[PDB]
Enzyme design. Sequence first.
Site: not given
Lengths: 48, 52, 151, 151
Positions: D29, D51, D103
Amino acid sequence: ASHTTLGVQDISTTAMSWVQKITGGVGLIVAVAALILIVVLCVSFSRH
Amino acid sequence: SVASFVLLSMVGTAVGMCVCARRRCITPYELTPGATVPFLLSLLCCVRTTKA
Amino acid sequence: NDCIFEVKHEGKVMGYACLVGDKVMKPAHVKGTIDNADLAKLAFKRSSKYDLECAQIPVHMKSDASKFTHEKPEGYYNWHHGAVQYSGGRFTIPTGAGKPGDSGRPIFDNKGRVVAIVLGGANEGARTALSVVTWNKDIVTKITPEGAEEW
Amino acid sequence: NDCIFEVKHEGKVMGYACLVGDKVMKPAHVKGTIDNADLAKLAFKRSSKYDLECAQIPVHMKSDASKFTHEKPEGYYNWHHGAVQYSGGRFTIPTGAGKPGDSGRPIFDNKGRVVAIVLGGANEGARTALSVVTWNKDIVTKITPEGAEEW
């Protein structure tokens, strides 16, 4: 007529094979549900 | 008509055994403290299997 | 509020409910309603056979939950009213520490990890052997000695 | 430069990528480019389920690689913003230690072996439970708490 002696247990053509094929009952699925019920009871139902 | 009736009561008892089977899917695994049973859910797969 | 969690009904304590692991737990025999309206609106599942009530814990309260273990070595443990003796496969308490109303107390170890929930007890004079619901290798198990009274 | 490598996208800091073993790992992402131009041009493999975007580490970047292990005991560990609790199969952090943008940071043990990379988190009050992908017995597996958002 002269053949009038007939009732409701009257044999026929394919008809009784058809009512045989329609009678695919549920007792197998009932039995496996009874198996699950039994295996739940017998975790602690050794007495009564 | 009553033959269709008795066959639909047979389907009703199929529904009853299936709903008792889903309730006896739930009663061993309410959401136990462990909250992780692959050995249960990876073989049973009755309904809503995805909670570990 | 260290380990204390409670269901209360019309002013009187009707035992206790506890969120443990990922479950909201309440003894099924305790009649009444959880005395927090935010809690009172969740989907609860009842089991009469094991006297268990379960619900899914909402996410935003997860960090108050108790740690757990399936493994119960012999020794002494803690509950709300003091020490709890475990030995011989037998949980015992001093007679008089527990009465009808006390159902729901957790038992926790020296690291505060809950291992069992009190269901009731059988008074045998000087000591009382408690009737309990508990869990071991992810399977729920109820252990009831003969002549146990519901709490 | 201890365990973390910057990803930046159009002037704004955009997460992190990690060199682990012979692998380049990046959250899928995360848009943008790794701040090494030789790195940005490799063949990347996408996994939507996890992901993950992956690339082959070039031979010449021998000294930036981490060390790893599949073994994660229960306890406390370290990351850049402080302590990270592992217990119950769960990673948690003090609420506010992590935010959208964090992240890509790795999670590492007391011996500095990277064991996990953060994918996101679910606020549960006092602490926040991390959604993470990690390798148990060398197989990639995603551990996700309910209701987790990407950071």
